[PDB]
Design an enzyme around this catalytic site. Structure first.
Site, PDB file in Angstrom:
ATOM      1  N   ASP A 241     -18.598   8.032  15.795  1.00  0.00           N
ATOM      2  CA  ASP A 241     -19.043   7.885  14.022  1.00  0.00           C
ATOM      3  C   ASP A 241     -20.354   6.982  13.769  1.00  0.00           C
ATOM      4  O   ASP A 241     -20.972   6.397  12.808  1.00  0.00           O
ATOM      5  CB  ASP A 241     -17.691   7.450  13.386  1.00  0.00           C
ATOM      6  CG  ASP A 241     -17.908   5.928  13.685  1.00  0.00           C
ATOM      7  OD1 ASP A 241     -18.502   5.082  14.631  1.00  0.00           O
ATOM      8  OD2 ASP A 241     -16.742   4.870  12.649  1.00  0.00           O
TER       9      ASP A 241
ATOM     10  N   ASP B 277      -3.653  -3.260  14.327  1.00  0.00           N
ATOM     11  CA  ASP B 277      -4.110  -2.459  14.989  1.00  0.00           C
ATOM     12  C   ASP B 277      -2.908  -1.530  16.469  1.00  0.00           C
ATOM     13  O   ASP B 277      -2.169  -2.314  16.723  1.00  0.00           O
ATOM     14  CB  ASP B 277      -5.029  -3.066  16.011  1.00  0.00           C
ATOM     15  CG  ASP B 277      -6.436  -3.919  15.558  1.00  0.00           C
ATOM     16  OD1 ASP B 277      -6.668  -3.018  13.984  1.00  0.00           O
ATOM     17  OD2 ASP B 277      -7.329  -3.827  15.978  1.00  0.00           O
TER      18      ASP B 277
ATOM     19  N   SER C  16      -4.447  -5.377   7.947  1.00  0.00           N
ATOM     20  CA  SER C  16      -4.183  -3.619   8.618  1.00  0.00           C
ATOM     21  C   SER C  16      -3.972  -4.347   9.883  1.00  0.00           C
ATOM     22  O   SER C  16      -3.347  -5.641  10.207  1.00  0.00           O
ATOM     23  CB  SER C  16      -5.701  -3.379   8.643  1.00  0.00           C
ATOM     24  OG  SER C  16      -6.422  -4.539   9.319  1.00  0.00           O
TER      25      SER C  16
HETATM   26  O1  VO4 Z   1     -11.578  -3.885  17.504  1.00  0.00           O
HETATM   27  V1  VO4 Z   1     -10.572  -4.422  18.908  1.00  0.00           V
HETATM   28  O2  VO4 Z   1      -8.761  -5.285  18.267  1.00  0.00           O
HETATM   29  O3  VO4 Z   1      -9.013  -3.043  18.607  1.00  0.00           O
HETATM   30  O4  VO4 Z   1     -11.426  -5.630  20.078  1.00  0.00           O
HETATM   31  O1  VO4 Z   2     -11.602  -4.924   6.996  1.00  0.00           O
HETATM   32  V1  VO4 Z   2     -10.627  -5.088   8.647  1.00  0.00           V
HETATM   33  O2  VO4 Z   2      -9.425  -3.796   8.365  1.00  0.00           O
HETATM   34  O3  VO4 Z   2      -9.668  -5.738  10.049  1.00  0.00           O
HETATM   35  O4  VO4 Z   2     -11.623  -4.498   9.353  1.00  0.00           O
END
Ligand code: VO4
Ligand code: VO4
Ligand code: VO4
Ligand code: NA
Length: 129
Positions: free
Chosen positions: A101, A52, A50
């Site tokens: 959520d 961010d 994934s």
């Molecule tokens: O979970 V943040 O990487 O979006 O700390």
């Molecule tokens: O299951 V991970 O997508 O980085 O949160």
């Protein structure tokens, strides 16, 4: 866009994050600082494949579609690239769904480890808003 601290505080307040689900504006500014260094263009790939995205580092595993996160959800119903705009609307609207959520701002690892339980009002000190 790389926001200034007070410029981002003002933008987040205008978009309804001040006291959203009880999280003061300084919590959101602190979270953005440690997630993205206030940079709307920030991207970071996670170990599980994934990514961010944006000022609040919203994860393609659950919240947006980036075309390369297999078996993920798109709960904010947006392309992940929308979260990189100079305009923080999409990131804020999606963050309101995330914080609602059940896990609150613990969804943001940087907030839990660097902001939670600190003097977060410091992040808005001196700002007009
Ligand atoms: O979970 V943040 O990487 O979006 O700390
Ligand atoms: O299951 V991970 O997508 O980085 O949160
Ligand atoms: O008015 V934008 O928030 O969609 O600056
Ligand atoms: Na996704």
């Amino acid at each position: 866009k790389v926001f200034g601290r007070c410029e981002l505080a003002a933008a987040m307040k205008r978009h309804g994050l001040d006291n959203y689900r009880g999280y003061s504006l300084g919590n959101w500014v602190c979270a953005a600082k440690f997630e993205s260094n206030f940079n709307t263009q920030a991207t970071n790939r996670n170990t599980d494949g994934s990514t961010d995205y944006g000022i609040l580092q919203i994860n393609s595993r659950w919240w947006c579609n980036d075309g390369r996160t297999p078996g993920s959800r798109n709960l904010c119903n947006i392309p992940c690239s929308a979260l990189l705009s100079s305009d923080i609307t999409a990131s804020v609207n999606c963050a309101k769904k995330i914080v609602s959520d059940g896990n609150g701002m613990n969804a943001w690892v940087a907030w839990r480890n660097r902001c939670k339980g600190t003097d977060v009002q410091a992040w808005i000190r001196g700002c007009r808003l």
